[PDB]
């Protein structure tokens, strides 16, 4: 595909009309049409009108009489908005009538019409000698041979040349033209040689490699800069055309070398001609910015003037020393030869050199236009770093990067009202267990719960977390864009919670349009509003699970026992407006109207009852444990006595508290109480506060007391912390291979030459790094890159500091981002619940692993893409046994990581457990290597095999993660599981196929039968805070609702020898 | 006055660059003929929209 | 939960632009947008207009020439 | 007086957030002003402002005429 394939042709000659068409080239009878006769456009940003005539008229000089026409007055008439199409068409049409080119029509089919001379003579009003010649002998404008079209006028005038003014392409700007073209009387090539050689004796002139009408024409610029912009536009043209010829596609090119040849010019133009001739790889790569094209070309000529490549430098220099010569690739020259063959007497520039183009292997990345580049740094690469200097990141303005404390959660509106349940397990509550649990509860309450837990629970409030969604619903309702929704739908509730006004449907699934001029204020919500709403939805879901409508039944009532403003009472009253007879009242000791203000326990005189009760009582006063206990007990007592379906809050849900509550419901005469712990998606993500759900049932409740329940453990595992909470740093210095960075993120800016370097260095900590230049003219690249602990635990295993720096230097300068918009990174990004559970697993197992002495290696079977690497200490060897793992022998050798890349064999005879080894089986036991779920009996079997296989080894420790059966019982009754499911009774985490779960009792019994030492541990609250802190992650809402029940029901078996 | 503000914020002068782009002063200085030989030109006659 | 947990920082310094952005801190090419470039509001009870420029412009002294611009004539 | 009162509101709110223990992007640890020379009434404002009285957390004061509320509070 070397040879250029192009049909060269004189397009400018083709544009010249047959003489007969000149009478009607204006098309006087019919109006000009957009896109055919003209191309009007209005750049509202620049506020600049631009009319561009099409066809023969694109080349048109205007007599000053033509400018006096109203059509040219229009852009001044409309400074601000686009000229209306009616006025444009009407005025342009009348001016089109106004024009009439001189001609003599004739029968000969070979004839053309010298349109250039015709319009020019017209525009001068025939006062130039060319104008007289035309006005007296219009037939002279007709021509057969294109060149003799002018030779006739030259011989007729006795002049050696004419100097035509150039058209401005937009007809609205009247600004003085940069240059004019001078047509010469040079019929033979020799006359042209002479005119060129004389042309090198005089300033500011240049000419095309070949000329239209086959008549020599020279541009003469009024200033140096005008020449520079001209040359640059032509270099763009020839570069694009050569870019198409190089791809080998056929092109209708007007001439083989589209760019200009200086004949006399300043140094800067000679530079432009030289790099323009070079056809530098940098244009194909889009390395230059075209916004200020000529400048880019000057800098490029600079780099070439002292290029590292001797060939390119000597070639550029040679092109600069002899700028009058037209350098061209051999493939161009063969095209020129074909052209000389087709038209033997054609004129084309005689002084020309045929250089061989110099190949360059460096493929620069580029992408101009908006969009930050979201890098994924490699851990290692071909480049070998040695003692790299610290790379300071510059300060960056808020004009470019803001750092919001928390990421607002994107979520479907229904998901907010989800909740999870946790039913009691224990059949009895022995008194020794009471003394123990009370000891743990008093000791826990007396010294306040973890400071980091509080920092998170208060940094990530649910109200600001759900804010954009609610304000979005209000913003769509205000524009009238919202329309259809069910009367009882959760979307209806969100709508009632978004706006202060009463909503009323005009019919089924159709809300009333807003009255004109009425824009009701958004409904006021405190932090506990959405939560109370979700507890209401939970009550409706608990009375029956089948329901889709959430409206209360007629002649029924609800109470929201905790009350101040209690906005939820208002949103509920507004949600049920079409339902007859629905009492809804708050009733706090701090209650404002509508809500009645009254203390709990209720006064003996007052009569209170309801079919539903949503207590939210929480004394602000600091108090002794006995008083908090008796108060919570009396609260649940009156809540149960006053309603068939209480939904009481518990601020301090210790096992002792909840069990004492159950003992109290047991003590009440004649009414057995079914009960369940609960937590909504609308609760604050980190609150350990729990909603116990009371309801009478005719049967006595088997297994009524709690023990090691999820919702409780979310609280009790949290305790006073040994260390201060980890505040997210914003690093600006990127040390080479330091391992001294606290959790948080690098953020800042660097000069773009230094950009590839910094990416090569932040790769050590950051796993992925967004970057962007802010503008084409702004050299700095902004960089944001949060620190991944997994990347640290990987990269710092050995002292080698390799990276893909050679790849990153391909990026500069256009290849690493562009975005004018301010970007808003968060100190606490959103994550799916499964990922956070995985990080809690890794924190638990890592803290468990640091405690062990004298362990030679960590073997994570099913380790995928080194995902468990965060657990293993930098010393001990790491080993992966996942078939899915990709092989990287360089990374393996450089980072001390053996990788089996074969399926693990769970059969005991095939087992090969080394002494002093830590075998990780984190969620790998539940799946076959191809991904299909293994049946639960097979899972318990392979656990039994890993258990018996370890029985011989003197020192070993397995960590077999698995799912407990109880979770399926809980997710059958819960709602807040957007990710986790229960397809046909099996768990379905993420995108994995559903998998049957082991029962904990049979597994522990089996391990007792094996005789192996074992311990069924799960990650705690402090591990969660550790994960969220170290990773820079915030939990989110639905994740915070389901995390307790999910993480409590993913135990890690801890086999030990 | 408004267009005058928009024009004069650009500068009362400019210099053609070595790349040939215009570079306006950004300042509202009164012109003096001493500048006629200087790199600067009056901004009114730039013919830049 | 006794210890205060706060990241102190010079926000006013953070608001100061890199010098390159000063050429286009006005964003001359594109129109100012509500809620990003400015925050106009009209208290109909008080009948008081209130325009509040956003970003770097929140801190902005006005030359008496700037006050002579029609934009400041609007509330009247 | 109005300046000091606005700053006392600011520091009181910020301290209200720090007391809850939530992480805050506070510009400076003590948002309120220090008189260097001032009238008696400002010295009163600085004193109750420093006190971080329970009355602000309880919303006992009316903020509609904030400085006045603070003067009466300094009286009590
Ligand atoms: N006044 C006038 N000028 C013309 C006419 N035809 C061509 N020109 C000018 O002749 C110059 C060189 O002619 P061409 O080679 O055909 O045009 P070009 O150099 O390829 O560049 P473009 O005109 O932009 O397409 C251009 O700058 C045109 O402005 C015409 O009919 N009338
Ligand atoms: N062909 C070519 N020659 C150059 C270039 N830059 C410098 N020179 C040579 O250097 C001489 C003057 O050097 P300088 O005064 O440093 O060039 P400059 O105008 O300041 O341009 P810069 O190198 O970008 O600073 C000229 O006569 C040229 O021969 C270039 O980019 N291309
Ligand atoms: N620090 C402090 N001193 C006060 C206050 N009120 C009175 N004093 C003292 O009392 C002196 C003057 O007393 P008054 O004239 O009764 O005070 P006042 O200006 O009338 O203000 P009121 O007590 O509200 O009537 C001052 O010099 C103060 O030292 C107060 O509210 N705060
Ligand atoms: C955490 S607040 C939330 C209240 C309500 N959910 C709302 O919309 O704001 C709980 C309120 O219950 C009130 N309260 C405290 N003790 C109470 C009691 N013993 N009996 C009735 N209300 C009480 C307190 O004044 C407290 O403001
Ligand atoms: C839960 S994923 C990875 C475990 C852990 N969450 C992680 O990211 O490192 C389990 C992977 O182990 C692989 N796997 C499944 N069965 C295996 C087996 N019998 N032996 C080794 N690897 C297996 C599967 O390809 C699956 O992708
Ligand atoms: Mg052309
Ligand atoms: Mg301030």
UniProtKB/Swiss-Prot annotation, chain B:
It comes from the Viruses. It is found in: Virion. Homodecamer; each decamer is made up of two conformers of VP2, called VP2A and VP2B. 12 homodecamers assemble to form an icosahedral capsid. Belongs to the turreted BTV-fold inner capsid family. Inner capsid protein that self-assembles to form an icosahedral capsid with a T=2 symmetry, which consists of 120 copies of VP2, with channels at each of its five-fold vertices. This capsid constitutes the innermost concentric layer of the viral mature particle. This is Inner capsid protein VP1. The lineage of its organism: Viruses, Riboviria, Orthornavirae, Duplornaviricota, Resentoviricetes.
């Amino acid at each position: 595909m070397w040879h250029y394939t192009s049909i060269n042709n004189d397009t400018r000659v083709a544009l010249d009309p047959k003489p007969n068409q000149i009478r009607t080239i204006t098309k006087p009878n019919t109006v000009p049409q957009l896109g055919t006769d003209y191309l009007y456009t209005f750049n509202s940003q620049r506020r600049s009108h631009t009319l561009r005539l099409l066809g023969p008229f694109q080349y048109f000089n205007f007599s000053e009489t033509d400018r006096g026409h109203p059509l040219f007055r229009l852009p001044l008439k409309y400074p601000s908005k686009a000229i209306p199409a009616d006025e444009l068409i009407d005025n342009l049409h009348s001016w089109m009538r106004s024009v009439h080119l001189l001609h003599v029509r004739s029968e000969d089919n070979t004839l053309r019409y010298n349109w250039m001379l015709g319009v020019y003579a017209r525009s001068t009003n025939y006062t130039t000698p060319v104008g007289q010649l035309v006005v007296n002998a219009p037939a002279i404008l007709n021509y057969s041979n294109p060149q003799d079209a002018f030779n006739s006028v030259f011989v007729a005038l006795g002049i050696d040349y004419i100097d035509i003014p150039i058209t401005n392409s937009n007809i609205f700007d009247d600004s003085s033209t940069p240059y004019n073209v001078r047509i010469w009387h040079a019929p033979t090539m020799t006359e042209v040689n002479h005119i060129l050689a004389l042309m090198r004796k005089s300033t500011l002139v240049s000419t095309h490699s070949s000329w239209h009408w086959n008549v020599l024409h020279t541009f003469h610029y009024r200033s140096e800069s005008d020449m520079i912009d001209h040359f640059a536009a032509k270099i763009l043209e020839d570069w694009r055309q050569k870019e198409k010829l190089d791809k080998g596609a056929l092109v209708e090119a007007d001439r083989v070398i589209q760019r200009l040849i200086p004949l006399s010019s300043s140094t800067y133009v000679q530079r432009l001609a030289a790099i323009g001739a070079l056809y530098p790889n940098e244009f194909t790569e889009n390395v230059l910015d075209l916004s200020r094209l000529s400048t880019a070309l000057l800098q490029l000529s600079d780099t070439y003037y002292q290029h590292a490549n001797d060939q390119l430098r000597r070639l550029y220099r040679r092109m600069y020393n002899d700028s009058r010569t037209l350098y061209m690739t051999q493939r161009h020259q063969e095209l020129l030869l074909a052209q000389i063959t087709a038209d033997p007497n054609i004129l084309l520039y005689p002084y020309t050199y045929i250089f061989t183009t110099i190949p360059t292997s460096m493929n620069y990345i580029s992408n101009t236009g908006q969009g930050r580049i979201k890098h994924s740094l490699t851990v290692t690469g071909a480049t070998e770093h040695d003692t790299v200097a610290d790379i300071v990141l510059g300060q960056t303005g808020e004009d470019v990067i803001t750092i919001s404390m928390v990421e607002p959660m994107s979520i479907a509106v229904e998901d907010m009202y989800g909740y999870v349940l946790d039913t009691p397990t224990r059949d009895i509550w022995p008194a020794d267990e009471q003394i123990e649990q009370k000891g743990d509860a008093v000791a826990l309450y007396d010294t306040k719960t973890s400071r980091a837990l509080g920092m998170f629970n208060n940094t990530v409030r649910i109200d600001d977390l759900l804010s954009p969604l609610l304000s979005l619903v209000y913003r769509t309702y205000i524009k009238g864009d919202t329309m259809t929704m069910t009367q009882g739908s959760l979307d209806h509730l969100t709508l009632c919670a978004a706006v202060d006004s009463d909503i009323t449907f005009v019919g089924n699934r159709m809300i009333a349009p807003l009255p004109e001029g009425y824009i009701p204020k958004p409904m006021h919500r405190n932090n506990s509003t959405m939560k109370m709403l979700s507890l209401y939805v939970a009550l409706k879901k608990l009375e029956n699970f089948a329901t889709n409508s959430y409206l209360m039944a007629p002649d029924t009532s609800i109470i929201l026992l905790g009350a101040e403003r209690e906005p939820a009472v208002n949103i509920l009253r507004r949600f049920n407006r079409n339902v007859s007879n629905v009492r809804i009242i708050g009733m706090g000791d701090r209650a404002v109207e509508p809500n009645i203000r009254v203390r709990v326990p209720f006064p003996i005189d007052k009569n209170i009852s309801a079919d539903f009760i949503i207590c939210d009582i929480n004394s602000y006063e600091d108090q002794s444990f006995e008083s908090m206990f008796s108060e919570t007990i009396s609260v649940v007592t009156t809540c149960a006595s006053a309603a068939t379906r209480a939904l009481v809050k518990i601020n301090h849900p210790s096992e002792y508290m909840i069990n004492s509550v159950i003992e109290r419901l047991s003590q009440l005469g004649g009414v057995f109480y079914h009960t369940a712990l609960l937590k909504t998606a609308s609760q604050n993500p980190y609150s350990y506060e729990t909603y116990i759900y009371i309801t009478p049932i005719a049967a006595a409740v088997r297994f009524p007391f709690y023990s090691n329940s999820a919702m409780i453990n979310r609280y009790m595992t949290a305790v006073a912390d040994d260390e201060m909470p980890i505040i997210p740093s914003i690093h600006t210095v990127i040390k080479g291979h330091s391992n001294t960075y606290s959790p948080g993120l690098f953020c800042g800016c660097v000069d773009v030459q230094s950009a590839p370097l910094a990416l090569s260095q932040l790769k050590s900590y950051c796993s992925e790094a967004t970057t962007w230049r802010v503008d084409s003219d702004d050299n700095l690249v902004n960089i944001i890159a949060r620190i991944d602990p997994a990347r640290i635990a990987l990269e710092f295993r050995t002292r080698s500091n390799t990276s893909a720096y050679h790849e990153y230097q391909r990026y500069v300068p256009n290849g690493l981002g562009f975005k004018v918009r301010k970007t808003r990174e968060f100190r606490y990004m959103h994550r799916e619940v499964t990922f956070i559970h995985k990080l809690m697993m890794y924190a638990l197992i890592r803290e468990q692993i640091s405690l062990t002495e004298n362990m030679t290696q960590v073997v994570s079977i099913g380790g995928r893409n080194l995902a468990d690497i965060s657990v293993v200490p930098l010393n001990m060897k790491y080993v992966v046994i996942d078939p899915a793992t990709r092989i990287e022998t360089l990374t393996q050798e450089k980072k001390n990581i053996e990788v089996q890349s074969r399926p693990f064999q769970f059969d005991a005879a095939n087992m090969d457990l080394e002494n002093n080894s830590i075998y990780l089986f984190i969620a790998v036991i539940m799946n076959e290597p191809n991904g299909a779920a293994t049946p639960a009996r097979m899972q318990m079997d392979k656990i039994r095999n890993v258990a018996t296989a370890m029985l011989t080894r003197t020192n070993c420790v397995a960590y077999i993660s698995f799912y407990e059966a109880g979770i399926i019982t809980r997710l059958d009754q819960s709602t807040a599981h957007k990710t986790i499911r229960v397809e046909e009774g099996r768990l379905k985490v993420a995108n994995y196929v559903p998998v049957d779960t082991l029962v904990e009792a049979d597994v522990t019994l089996m391990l007792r039968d094996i005789g192996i030492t074992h311990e069924i541990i799960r990650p705690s609250t402090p591990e969660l805070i550790d994960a969220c802190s170290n990773y820079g992650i915030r939990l989110g809402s639905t994740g915070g609702a389901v995390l307790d029940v999910f993480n409590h029901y993913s135990p890690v078996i801890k086999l030990v020898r | 006055p408004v267009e005058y503000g928009i024009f004069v914020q650009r500068g009362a002068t400019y210099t053609i660059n070595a790349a040939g782009e215009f570079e306006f002063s950004g300042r509202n200085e009164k012109w003096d003929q001493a500048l006629y030989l200087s790199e600067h030109f009056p901004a009114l006659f730039s013919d830049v929209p």
